[model samples]
Target: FDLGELKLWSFWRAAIAEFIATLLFLYITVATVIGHSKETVVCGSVGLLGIAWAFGGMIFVLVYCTAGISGGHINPAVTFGLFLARKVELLRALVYMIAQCLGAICGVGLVKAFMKGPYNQFGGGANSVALGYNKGTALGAEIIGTFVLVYTVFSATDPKRSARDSHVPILAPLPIGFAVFMVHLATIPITGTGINPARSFGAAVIFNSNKVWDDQWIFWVGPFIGAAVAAAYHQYVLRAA
Candidate 1:
C-alpha cells in the first residue's frame, strides 16, 4: 500500500463517493433531529424512531449507491475499523476520513442553511450528554454503541459473506444500517447516540454550542476506542472461527 499513491481514478472516485454520501447522511439525519427538537414539533413528530430511521435509511440508500465505487464507508469509525483490519490501505483510509469529515460538515452546514430556524432553536442536532447523565455514562454509551456498529460492519462485509450473497447487491449495507438503527435506539437518551464521530462532529461544527463543544471528546475518543476493540475482537477472536 503506497502511502503516496494518488492520481488513481478509483481513489479519487472513492473520496468523492464518501463526500457525497456523508453529506447527504448528515443533512437528512441532523435535519430530522433538529426538526424533532423544535417546540412546535415536540408534541408530535417523527421522534426517536424516526430519527433512527433517518440515519439508518440514509446509510442504506447511500451504501447502495456508492458501495461498488468506494465500499460506502460514510462514517469515520467504520473507516478506522476497516483500516485496523487491513480492509483498506493507509492512504485510502486517510483520504476517506478527510472526505467523511468534510462531507459531514457540509451536511450540517446545509442543515443550518436551509433549516435555520429549527436548527438554531434546537442546536442543529449537535450531540450532548442528557440532563441526568454524567460524562462517564455518556462515554460508556458511545463506546458500546460504536462497538455494536463497527462489529456489525465487519461481519456484514466479510469476505465469507461476499462469496455467499446472491442478489440485489444489498447484503452488507442493509445489516449495517440496521445496526446503526438498533444502536441509536439504545443510546439516544444518553449522548444523543454518537456512534459515528463524523456525524457528531459535523453537527457540533455547525452548531458550536457550549454543551456540544464541551462533550466533543467523548464522541471521538469513545468511537475510536470502540472501533479499535471491535477490530481486535473480530480479527483476533472471530476470524479463525
Candidate 2:
C-alpha cells in the first residue's frame, strides 16, 4: 500500500464500489426506521438509540466487506478529511467523494420510490435540529460527535496500537460502530446526530421537507471539521513510536 503508487482500480470499479456500499448503508438505515415505524408492539419502538446503533453496526459491516476494494469511505466528508490529513491523494479523494454523494442520492431516491404516496410522512430517516435546537447547538453537537467517531477510528485502526498491545485486535468495524453508537447516545437530542455527511445528504435529499436542505451545511462542515481535528491529534498526540 505505497502511497505514491496507490491506485486501487479504474473509474468503473470505484463507482461500483461506492454504489454498492452507499446503497447498502442507506437501505439498512432507512429500512430500520421503516421497520420501527410499521411496528408498535416493541414497547417504545427502536427509538433514537436503536437507530444510532443500527447505523453504526451497518457501517461496520460494510467497511469490513469493502475496505480492500474501496477504502470503505461511504461518506464524502470522511474522504475529504482523509485527503486533508494527507492519507489519500487529492484526485482519489475527489473521485471517492463524488461517488459517495452520487451513491447517497441513488439510495435515498430508492427509498422515496418505495415509500411514495402518503407513507412519505416519516421523514425518510432524515436528520435535523430537533425542537429547541439552534444552529449553534447543532453545529457544536455534530462537531463533537464526528470528532469522537473519527478519532476512535484512527486509534482503533492504527497499526501501532495493534503492535504495541497485542490485546488490541485489528478489527476495524466493531470499534467504529461502537464509537457511532456512543456519539448518538450523547448527541441525538442535539441535532439528530449526523456525523456522516453522505448519510445526512441521503436522508435530506429524499425527505426534502421541513427545511432539511437549509441546514445541510452543518452536516458537511461539522464532520469535516471533526475529522480534521481528529487526524491532527492522531498525527501529533497519538503518533506511535
Candidate 3:
C-alpha cells in the first residue's frame, strides 16, 4: 500500500543489505552443516554444539552489520512477524522475504558449487523430520522453537527498553542470535530446526529431494504460526495497556 517508500534510495538499499546478509548467513551456516555431516563421528568434527554456534554466530555478526540498513531480518519469519506487529509495511516485508530467499538459494548454490562431492554425499543440509519423529512431533518442535525466536526478537527490539536503558545500547542482535542457538540445541534432532522458511527452502530447492519437499509444509506453516502467535502475544498481551 505504501508505494512512497519505493521512491526512496533507502528502501532499495535496505533490500540489498538483506540480500547480502542472508547470502553470507546461509553460506556459512550450510557449509558448517555439510562439514559436520561429513565427519566420521569420532570427534573428527565440530559436533551439534558447533553447528548451533555457526547459525547463532553468523546471525549475530550479520545482524550487527545490517541492522542499521534493513533492520537485519535475514529470516522471512522475522519479517512476517514484524509486519504483523506493524513494525514494517506490507510491501517492505514482502520484498525483504523475496530478497532473503533469493540470497539463501544463491548461498547454498555456492556451497554445492565449491564442495560438490561433500554436499552431495551429505544431504545439502536440508531440513527433514527424523525417522523416529512423526510429522506432528516435528511440527510441535518447530512451532515452539520459532515462538522462542520471534518472542526474543520482539523483546530485544522493544522501543521501551531503549529509553529506559540509555547507558546500555541495545545489542538486539546478540539476544536474538542466542535465541536461535538455544532453539537449535533443543530441536535439531527433531526437524533440523527449520525456524526460518528461507533456510529450509533454499536447501530443499538445491537438494531437489522428494523427502525434503514432502515435509516442507511444516517449515512454512509452523514458523508462520509461531510468528503470528508471537506477534499477538507481544502486541496484545505484553504491550497491552
Candidate 4:
C-alpha cells in the first residue's frame, strides 16, 4: 500500500473514485437545503431529520462503493484521525486528505453551478454557530459530536472487534453514518454541526461567505481535538487483549 507501489492508472482511478463519491455526497446534502430556503419552495421540505438521514445514508453508500479502491475517506478529518490512530500510514493520510479536499471543492462547486439561484444570499448549507449559541457552547458541542463520530468509526472498523465473532454486526458505514446523524440531531442548533472540517470548508469556500469563515476554525480545531482523544482512547485504552 505504498505510494510508489500504486500504478499511475490505479492512482488516478482511486482519485476519481473519491471525486465521484464526494461530489454525490455534497450535492445531496446541499440539495436537502433547497426546500428549506425562504426563496424557493420545492415540494415538501426534508427538514433537519431528513437531511441528517440523507447524509448518513450517503456516507454508507459511498463507503461501500469506494472503500475497495480508495479506502473511502470522504472526509479529511476522518483520514487524519485514522492516521493518528495508526489505521493508516502518514503518506496515505496526506494523500487522502488532499484528495478529499479537492473532491469536496468540486462537489460544492457543482452544487453552486446547477442550483440556478443566488448562492451567497443563502447559507450554502455551510455549518455555523446558530443565533443565540455562544462560541464556547458551539465549540463544546462540536468536540463531543466529533468524539462520538470518531469513536464509533473505530469501533465499527476495528478488526479485533470483528474477529471476536461478536454478535454486533460489522457494517462499517452504518455506524459511521448513524453517529453523524445523531451528532447532527444533537448539535444542529448549536453550530449547525460541522463534525467534518472538509464539509464545512468546502461549503464556505463555494459560498464565499463570512459567517462560515467566522467560526470555521472552531470546526477544524474542535473536531481535530476530539478525534485525537478518541483515537488515543481506542489505541491505548481499548486495545485488544
Candidate 5:
C-alpha cells in the first residue's frame, strides 16, 4: 500500500465507507451509552462493561469490514494521527474527517430520533467532564486515553515489526479495541473516555446542551494533543524512524 496515494473515485469511495461506517458505529454505541446510563431501564441493559464492549465491538467489526475501503477510520483523531505519520495525504485526511463527522452526526441523529426524550435526558451519550472532576483532570484523562489508542494503532500496524508477527491478520484492530475498552474502563468515571473526537463531537453537536457544549474543546484538544504525541513518539522515538 503506497500510504499516501489517492485516486478520485477510490478516495471518494473510501470516504463513503467512512461515512457509513461511522454512522453505524455511532448508532450502536451511542444507543448503548444512552440505554446503559438510564436509571429507568432495569430489565436489560449492557451496563458499563457492555457499553465498553459496544465501543470496542463496533470498532472491531467495522474495521474488519471497511479496512480495505477506507481503512475504517471513523474518527478524526485517527485521521490526524495517520496524517502526521504520512499514512494519508493532507487533502484526503481533511475529506475523511468531514465524512466521518457528517456520518457521526447522522448516526447520533438516528439515536435521538429513536430514543427521543431519553436521549437528552441521559446526556445523549455525550462526553463531558463528570462532576467533581476539574477540566484539567478530564483533559488529562482524554489525553492519556487517546495516547493509549494511537500508540496501539502505530505499534500494531508497524511495518518493521517481527516478520513472524507480520503474518498474522487483524493485528491492529484487536489491540486497538482493547485500548478503547481499557481506556473506557479506566477513565469513564472521570470523563466518559472521549478518545475519539468525532464520537464526542457528534454527541456534543446533537446534545448541544449548555453543559456539554462548553466542554467540547477539552475532548478535541485532549485527543489531538494525545494523538499528536503518539504519532511523534511511535514514528520517531519508539520505531526510530
Candidate 6:
C-alpha cells in the first residue's frame, strides 16, 4: 500500500545489492552442484556435504555483506516472511523478489555460459521432486525446511534479542546459514531443498525441463506457506511478550 519507498535512492541501491548478491549466490552454488554431479572419479567432488556448505556459506557471506544495505534477502521466501511480519514494506518486498529472481537467472546463465556441455548433462542444478518421493512428502519437506530457515531469520535478527544481549555477541548470519545447511542436509533427496523460491525458479528457467516444471508449484507454494507460518509463529507465539 505504501508507495513512498519508490522515490528513495536507497531503495534502488538496495535492490541492486540484492540483485548482485543473489547473482553471486546462485552462480557459486549452481557451479558447485554441476561440479560435483559431473565428476566420474570416486569421491572426486565435494559431494552432498559440500553442496550444503555451498548454500550455507554463500548465505553467510552475502547476508553479511548486504544486510546493512538491503536487509540481505537473497531468497524470496525470506523476503516474503519479513513482509508477513511487517519487517519490510509491500513494494520493497516485491522489488527485492524481482531483483533476487533476475540475479538468479543471470547467475545460472553464467554457469551455462561457462560449461554448456556439463550444464545440460548434469540437469543444470534444477530442483525437482525425486523419483521415489511423492509430491506430498516433498511439500512437507519444503514446508518444514523453510520453516527452519525463516524461523531462524526471525529469532536471529529480533530487535529484542539484540537489545537484551549484553555480554554475548550473536552474529545473525551464522545461524541463518547453519539453518540453510541443516535443511539441505535433510531435504536434498526430496525436493532438492527449494526453501528459496528464487533458487528453484532460476534453475528451472534455465534448465527448462518439463519434469522440473511439473513439480514447480511445490517449491513456490511450500516456501511461501512455510514463511507465513514462521512469521505467525514467531510474531504471535514466541514474541507474545
- Inter-residue clash pairs, candidate 5: none
Alpha carbon lDDT at 67, candidate 1: 72
Better of 5 and 6 by TM-score: 6
Candidate with more favorable, higher TM-score: 1 or 4: 1
- Candidate with maximal lDDT: 6
lDDT of 3 by residue, 1-241 (tens): 3365543576788788888888898899999999998888788889889999999888889878876667788999998988888777888889989999999999999999989999988988899999999999999999888999989888877463321112111337999899999999999989889899989998999988998999999999999999999989988999831
Clashes of each: 0, 0, 0, 0, 0, 0
lDDT per residue as tens, model 1, 1-241: 4354533765687789899999999999988888778746445988889998998888888877777678888989888988887777788888988899999999999989997988888767888898998999999899988999888877777463321111112237888888888888889888878888889889889998887899999999999999999989988998731
- List the lowest-lDDT window of 10 residues for candidate 1: 162-171
Better lDDT candidate (2, 6): 6
What do the candidate models score in CA lDDT, each in turn? 0.82, 0.73, 0.85, 0.73, 0.81, 0.87
The sequence of per-residue lDDT tens digits that candidate 4 reaches over residues 102-170 is 777778888788774744556787888889978898888988888998887777673533211111122
**Lowest-lDDT window of 10 residues in candidate 4?**
162-171
Clashing pairs in 2: none
Residues 1-241, candidate 6, lDDT per residue (tens digit)? 2365543666788889889999999999999999999999989999999999999999999888877678778999999988887777798899999999999999999999999899999989899999998999999999999999999888777454321112111237888999999999999988778899999999999999999999899999999999999989988988832
Candidate 1: regions farther than 4 A off = 1-7, 39-43, 158-171
Total backbone collisions, model 2: 0
Off by over 4 Å in 5: 1-6, 39-44, 158-171
Preferred candidate (TM-score higher): 1 or 3: 3
Model 5: per-residue Cα lDDT at residue 174: 73
For candidate 3, which ten residues in a row score worst on lDDT?
Answer: 161-170
Query: What is candidate 3's TM-score against the reference?
Result: 0.91
Give the Cα-based TM-score of candidate 2 against the true structure: 0.85
Local distance difference test, candidate 6: 0.87
Clashes of 5: 0
Better model by TM-score: candidate 4 vs candidate 6? 6
lDDT of the structure predicted as candidate 5: 0.81
TM-score of 5: 0.89
Ordered by lDDT, highest first, the candidates read 6, 3, 1, 5, 4, 2
